[PDB]
Symmetry: C10
Subunit: 70 residues, 10 copies
């Protein structure tokens, strides 16, 4: 199991650590279909380019499962 | 073991956190075949375009499993 | 584990949440071979089109496993 | 993390069909005995494909057998 | 876990339900290398045909593992 | 877990069921590199033919793991 | 289970060992969409080049899951 | 779990069953990089031939893990 | 579970065995994005060459998970 | 679980069985980036050749995990 760090210590950490409520906010954005991911897309003859697509249903369902357990 | 956050705290959170009942609404839309996902589709010679398809049966069945356990 | 929501609360929810019996009806349709999924099919030279095919045996067997446990 | 169990009397009077335990095992048995088919895409040349039916694979028959062996 | 149904009830069922001994007979045929599966085989230029091949080693070893546990 | 059947009942079964010792004999043949599996091999331009190859190391190691636990 | 080393011993170690709070800072950067990974991208006719793409949604969701458990 | 058969019965079995110590000898040969597996190798234009390659690092590491647990 | 060898015996072993703290140092290098792996990269028409790429995000996240657990 | 064989019996075995300390030495070589594996590399038009590449990061991380648990 992951080491649990006091939420007061996460808050005063100079570099950002997400709190429990912020984890759920980010999972919520994914679950609501508001996020994108960068993937490689073919443009002809083996060549590819970077593009952004909506987060897949399998990843939204994983986010929903985690939200349902929280 | 996701941290469990009080539903009253989710409600007063400035940014949206999905509540338990809203998780089940979203899983229900998926299970009923009402949702789409964005995928890459070939259009010739290796080139692809973004398009929307129905959520696959494997993902609907995962939604149904989660609804059956809730 | 998924939060369990009272079936009375699912019923009065404004937006649809599937009840336990409705989960089993949808799994049953899959298991009986009555459902389809949308997939990409090649039509020549890398081009593809959307089409509907029967739900695969692996997904029917997963539906049957869930019905056997419910 | 277990499926809600519904009384078999309630399944029977449900308006829409819910498979009973014995009917689940009948459908797994058909698969296990090699009597079922699935629809797949088959190449017909140069990237073109067509829909066709093939026998259920051995991996899926073995999964049906495993489930029948546990029931 | 799968519901267990009385073997007397399986026997009187009009449609065939495999009994525990019959499951082990079918696994045994697979394990002994007596079974085939239908697969798609290339015949040139992306065209395919249906053919029968022996059940793979990975599937025989799964059958053997199950027989070893039964 | 798989239902474990009395070795006297396996013996009286009309059709053959592998006994515990016969399972370990077949696993041993695989582990010792004595078995083959049928696979599809390319012969040019997308065409394929059936041929026999030695059982892979991953499958031999699985056989060895099972023998080590028996 | 991984051997647990005293955080005082990690601190005086000559070579860097990440402390608990630093693990969470790195997971947070991933979860917030601030990190990249190096992958191979096609540039034509089977040739490829190295490029940087955003960390995928599946890996962000794993970082979020771990942060939710810490 | 696999049925455990008396090592005296393995020994008097007409056909060979590997004993515990022989399982570890075979795993050891794999771990030490002394074994090969047969694979299909391309020789041009989709044609392939059978050849032998060293057992992969993933399979050696699995052998090492099993030896470490025995 | 892996056989546990006394850390004093690991230290006097003629050939190197990594101690717990050294395992964590190496996981840390990975997690901090300091390591590379050798992969095959296409250079045209099916030919490939060996090159070094950064360790992927999935492997960094595994390192971070292990560090977070101990 | 693998049968546990007395280290005194491994030592007097005529054929080599790796002892616990020798398992850890081999895992250590892998973890330190000192080992190679044989793979197939394309040389043009579908033809391939055998070559040696560094063990991948995923396999190093598995070796490090195992060393961390020993």
């Amino acid at each position: 199991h992951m080491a649990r760090i006091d939420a007061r210590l996460k808050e005063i950490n100079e570099k950002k650590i997400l709190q429990a409520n912020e984890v759920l906010e980010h999972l919520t954005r994914i679950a609501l279909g508001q996020e994108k991911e960068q993937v490689l897309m073919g443009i002809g003859k083996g060549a590819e380019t970077k593009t952004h697509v909506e987060v897949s249903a399998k990843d939204r369902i994983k986010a929903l499962e985690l939200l349902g357990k929280a």
